[PDB]
Amino acid sequence: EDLYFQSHMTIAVTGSIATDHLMRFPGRFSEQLLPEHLHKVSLSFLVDDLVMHRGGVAGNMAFAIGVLGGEVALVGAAGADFADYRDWLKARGVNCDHVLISETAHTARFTCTTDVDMAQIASFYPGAMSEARNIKLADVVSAIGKPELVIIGANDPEAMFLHTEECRKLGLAFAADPSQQLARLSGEEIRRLVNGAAYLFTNDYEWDLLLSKTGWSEADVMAQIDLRVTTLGPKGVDLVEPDGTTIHVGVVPETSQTDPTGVGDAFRAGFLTGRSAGLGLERSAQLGSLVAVLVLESTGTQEWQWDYEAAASRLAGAYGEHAAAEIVAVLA
Amino acid sequence: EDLYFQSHMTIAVTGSIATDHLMRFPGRFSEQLLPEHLHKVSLSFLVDDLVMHRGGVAGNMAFAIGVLGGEVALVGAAGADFADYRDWLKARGVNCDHVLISETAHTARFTCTTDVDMAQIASFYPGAMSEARNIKLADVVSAIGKPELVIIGANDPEAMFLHTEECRKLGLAFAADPSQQLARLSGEEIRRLVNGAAYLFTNDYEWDLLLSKTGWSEADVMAQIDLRVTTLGPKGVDLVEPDGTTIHVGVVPETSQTDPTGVGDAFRAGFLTGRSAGLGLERSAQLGSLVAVLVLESTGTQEWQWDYEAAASRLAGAYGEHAAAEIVAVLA
After folding, report:
1. A46 FRET partner, CA 20 to 30 A, in A141, A149, B187, B280?
2. What is the distance between the alpha carbons of residues B154 and B149, in angstroms, rounded to a whole number?
3. Which residue of A has its CA nearest to B116?
């Protein structure tokens, strides 16, 4: 039990750890599908490109916090094949001591093949992700002390519930960050994820969906959480406090819409890194908005670069020189 | 130029280096296919198993020769992601100094998802395999001296031609081992692979196909090669010499028909290992037949085990104690 050497500002990121394997088929899938007998297909596609991206929401968020110089621990389940991904993350300052490594299953994987007309054939292999339910946050606390925040990201549904319950039991501040799981969890399951959250993150459609499925009003939710953070795509972000105060921050203008994948994760990482560095709500949202645009301008989710001077200049363009100065003061 | 420290009995294995990623879909693909609009599909399958196997014909053959204690160099093209596969092979005594590593492409990959009714949806990514055409056997010769034999396995078609031509140019004994490529190369292309071969390996259907496509008679082929080796599935193997002598060796009886994948590669490896250890044609075919059955009884192609005592006993059961003694005398 670590009593004398506890961590000072650690964000523990729970959620999915996966990779994405993306292949291109130069022709049309319809060429083999049209003559096919659909009750027992035999389809074989000669592809001409393979791209592999490191991912999972927890991997993406931990990567970004690490790159930005935050203190971060990745807490999710992966397979033995996680080894190279572990080295990648450690090189960016991510503590991976509390990643559970399955004895039997491989790291989760999304595989997608896309044809010339944008038809798609995909698979989802959850693998080791299902073992995240076996992770004990109590073990993290024993090792490094209470984290400053535990992010409850999209994951094995049971793990999301168990992690939330354990944060309540242990008295750990948590962020409810269910993102895409809102479109698959029941109202009952979603209601279990919310009470006591320091932060609730969603996009605007997901916010509406949360209210619809839970049967809760906005007021019912606000009475249970310390801050609602709702991203609005090109319209920016709303930060809504339970006192009825709203802070709205616009986006950092992009130079390309290269790939929206991982942008939400990047916003959350930048925002929470700002919060852990002592920035207020507005400044933290400004930082999150910069990290979001860097990811938007990059193919994949962890394939973006961090350049300090470019960040300062772009923050100044979007938000003025004073805001930029205050943000970069806590960065390097 | 290595003149004073040349290799003594090295088999250089050329051919494909790949991995196979096999996934299981617990339901029926027809469930999503029947209601689908085939001119632009959007299919997404939640799978519940992923198995990855190390493969490619050259990888399989090199693995087996290494396990059996032969001197072997793998000569094919792979991507940077070959690193773990390289370590796997080196641990079994395979020299990988002459594997070409692509700067841009990944190791070749076969991906296949199978449903409950044995419907299949697969992809083939050649990746780095196409760069095997850039390998120079002259570089192998500079490093280790002339190999005892170069196996021309299934590969990038251009690489198969170029390697054969280079063996002729450099005066290197070669085995024509085109296997599955016989069903995709033209008669003209196949004819270029044969003249001067120390060995021609095929199965029985492939032999018929070779004759059909080339327009050659058996006599036309036999006049050009030193030995024809034709596997006959459960009926064993024929070894046919250009003098009209035929040696037929039966199989080693199996205890299961677990997975026929890689059995041909295993036979070739065991046979050629026997030849390099000084065994005659019959004894070499007996050894090849043992390695073949071990692979038949194993899922995957390099996931079988080598046990010396079990090998001796099984050889004795199939071929008698005298043959077994003569074979194990050159093994360990």
Report:
1. B187
2. 16
3. A40
| Interface contact B122-A44, CB threshold 8 A | yes
- Minimal C-alpha gap between A80 and chain B (Å): 12
Residue B42 to residue A119, Cβ atoms within 8 A: yes
Q: Which residue has the tokens 């003209």?
A: B188
Q: Do B50 and A113 touch (CB under 8 A)?
A: no
Chain A residues whose beta carbon lies within 8 Å of the beta carbon of residue B121 = 41, 43, 121
Amino acid symbol at B11: I
Single-letter code of the amino acid located at A322 = H
Number of Cβ within a 10 Å radius of residue B136: 15
Q: How far is A235 from chain B (nearest CA, A)?
A: 30
C-alpha–C-alpha distance, residues A158 and A175, integer Å: 17
Residues 6 or more apart whose CB falls under 8 angstroms from that of B48 comprise A125, B24, B25, B26
Resolution of the deposited coordinates, in angstroms? 1.5
For residue A284, the one-letter residue type is S
B57: left (phi over 0), alpha (psi -120 to 50) or beta: alpha
- Closest CA relative to residue B213, chosen from B181, B240, B180, B191: B191
Name the phi and psi angles at A194, rounded to 5: -105, -45
The domains of chain B, with CATH numbers, are 1-332 (3.40.1190.20)
Q: Show residues of chain B in contact with A40, CB under 8 Å.
A: 30, 117-119
Closest CB to B40: pick one of A25, A44, A117. A117
Cβ-nearest to A120 among B38, B41, B118: B41
Q: Name the token pair of B47.
A: 């799978």
- What three-state secondary structure class fits A169? helix
Q: Is B243 assigned a catalytic role? A: no
Do the chains contact at B40 and A127, CB–CB below 8 Å? no
DSSP assignments along B242-298, one per residue: TTS-EEEEPPPPPS-----TTHHHHHHHHHHHHHHTT--HHHHHHHHHHHHHHHHTS
Degrees to nearest 5, angle at CA A130 with A124 and A133? 150
Are B45 and A119 inside 8 Å of each other by CB? Answer: no
In residues, how long is chain A? 332
* Rounded distance between C-alpha atoms, residue B227 and residue B223, angstroms: 10
